[model samples]
Target: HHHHHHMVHITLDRNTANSWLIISKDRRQVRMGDTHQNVSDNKERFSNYPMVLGAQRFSSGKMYWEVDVTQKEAWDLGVCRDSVQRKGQFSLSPENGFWTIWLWQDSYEAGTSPQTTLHIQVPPCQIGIFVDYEAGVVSFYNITDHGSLIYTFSECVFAGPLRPFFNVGFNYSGGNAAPLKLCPL
Candidate 1:
């Protein structure tokens, strides 16, 4: 089925970000902090999830956003239900309220109910996420590859409003320090 895509602008919500995550002044970019800051504990803040939710939420529509993840070694980007767990280590799967894709040590995987490994000759410097709420589909694309498909979650059951989700992994001596920038439309 051919899907018509429309660009959606999203910003990182600092309140939902990890203490060690560095959000840009404009809130459109996020990266792992070189040094962890002593951020006050908050119930909305992610303790072990290492993730942040977009300030905007979508209930129904076809939306798309691109993330610039150049030079990043590990990261996660996609959409998640607003009710998703924010504390503790939880399975990053659709059943767990997250329909996402991740990059770890140069390997990519779809965060589906059962994670699917993605084998691509070249890693994507910028990734695009497309979602059709009513159609129940979430797809990832390699923007550098003319929007080539990376992976997709079909028949997704979104229980509530979905928000753009992002994670730059934990801070580790500059490792995974590359910023994940939300591309301007």
Candidate 2:
């Protein structure tokens, strides 16, 4: 596995945020809003998907970022091709341009071609995402104790620039209110 300790800054792209997703003023943090707000159904907005894309896009080179998911019941983080489908029901797989790992019901699962189940001994409160575009590798790390390997997507084909992608599951009653903050580099 390839490893790098460098970190980068990332901010949520408000234009790509879902209607129920709330982005911080600085665009560095995002959380699920209690109520869906009235928003434009622009092509960039994720109408049916409860997720957001990062304002920064990477075509090559290594990049890393961390997300704080403390006290959150569920969330998804990783990288996706810029052209990923934003509407309708779609599989979160490399074939469809999404390479992500999700925390759901106290378990970690990699959103791969067949959806690999990760045997994480401890739940990760803070997670890190590392990408090597030229090598086609996207890795996730459990950053609680320095860092530990969670899962990785290898040999991923990049059709275009890849962007950091995030999703805090649907919890309209504020159950998943904890913001998925983008940690400063």
Candidate 3:
């Protein structure tokens, strides 16, 4: 009864990826490489971090999508403003144009204005994202627990179209080589 009515097809835009990021040919898998590849910098490219944006951009609708984080230990999944500056050292919070939930070293944190750390019962293997454009609401669900509520951002001010954001966490010397897979709806 929650999500899926407005299921959106999300594909990775390699042009929006960092040089150190590797997006599979299908554009659904994202991972990091130890060395940076030779790629020209573009306005859409993520220069400072290993982040990528989805091809689909939503402006006014309730959209739903899912990401597989079973094997990967570190990741950031959510929506972001396409106009946000990508080439710099900026915090990945709502104020910085990113509404996300991140998993780092077995800890989960909601990417809010003040960065709220989550202490839930069971960790999720698959993360589900639901957004309401008109209501300015962003919700994260844990599919591992029958779509349990993980976190939500309300009263957001979105100026432009929102794009699916995928941040593959630090490689840590190849420790996080597992690809972050965008699950098929």
Candidate 4:
């Protein structure tokens, strides 16, 4: 392993974002708005599940990116096989092309094939993601804790291209309205 990785500046693609989610003007942030916007319908759009994808496609590369996840009571962040349709079942497992980590209630968990519940505390304000496309692996790090390991999905059957995936959940009372923020590596 090298000390340096190709870190990406991710731009959330509006076309691929869910209509229920709102992308900020700079495209660096997205959040589940109180109401759905009048975004157009399309195949790339997430109709069934709420999510957003990075514009850059990685077919073969070792790359990194980070996101600010503070104050989101419920949130999901990770990578997904590009545009592979397998909605339902909550889109919470790698078996269905989604490899994500989430915060449910007050727990950290990964949407690994087994949907492993992660063990951590207080939560990291920022997260670091390292994806080795050639190696077919995804790693999640807690940036606030000196890059501590939160979870990692290995031996992924990545096909075609992969995009950075992001999502956030609102606490039942419409709380956690904070946005998923992309920050500098």
Q: How well is each residue in 14-34 modelled by candidate 4, as lDDT tens digits?
A: 998878888889899988877
lDDT of 2 by residue, 14-125 (tens): 9899998888899998887776877777788887767999999899899988899998888889999999998888888989999999978778789987989998887777
Model 1, range 1-185, lDDT digits (tens) per residue?
23324888788999998888889899998877655667787888988856888999999989988899898888889999999988888889988899999988768988876788997777799888899999999998888887788888899999999999998886564667678999888
- Which portions of model 4 show Cα errors greater than 4 Å? 1-4, 86-90
In TM-score terms, candidate 1 sits at 0.93
Off by over 4 Å in 3: none
- Higher-TM-score candidate among 2 and 3? 3
Q: Sort by TM-score, best first.
A: 3, 2, 1, 4
TM of each candidate vs. truth: 0.93, 0.94, 0.94, 0.91
lDDT of each: 0.85, 0.85, 0.87, 0.81
Best by lDDT: 3
Error of 1 at 123 (Å): 1.0
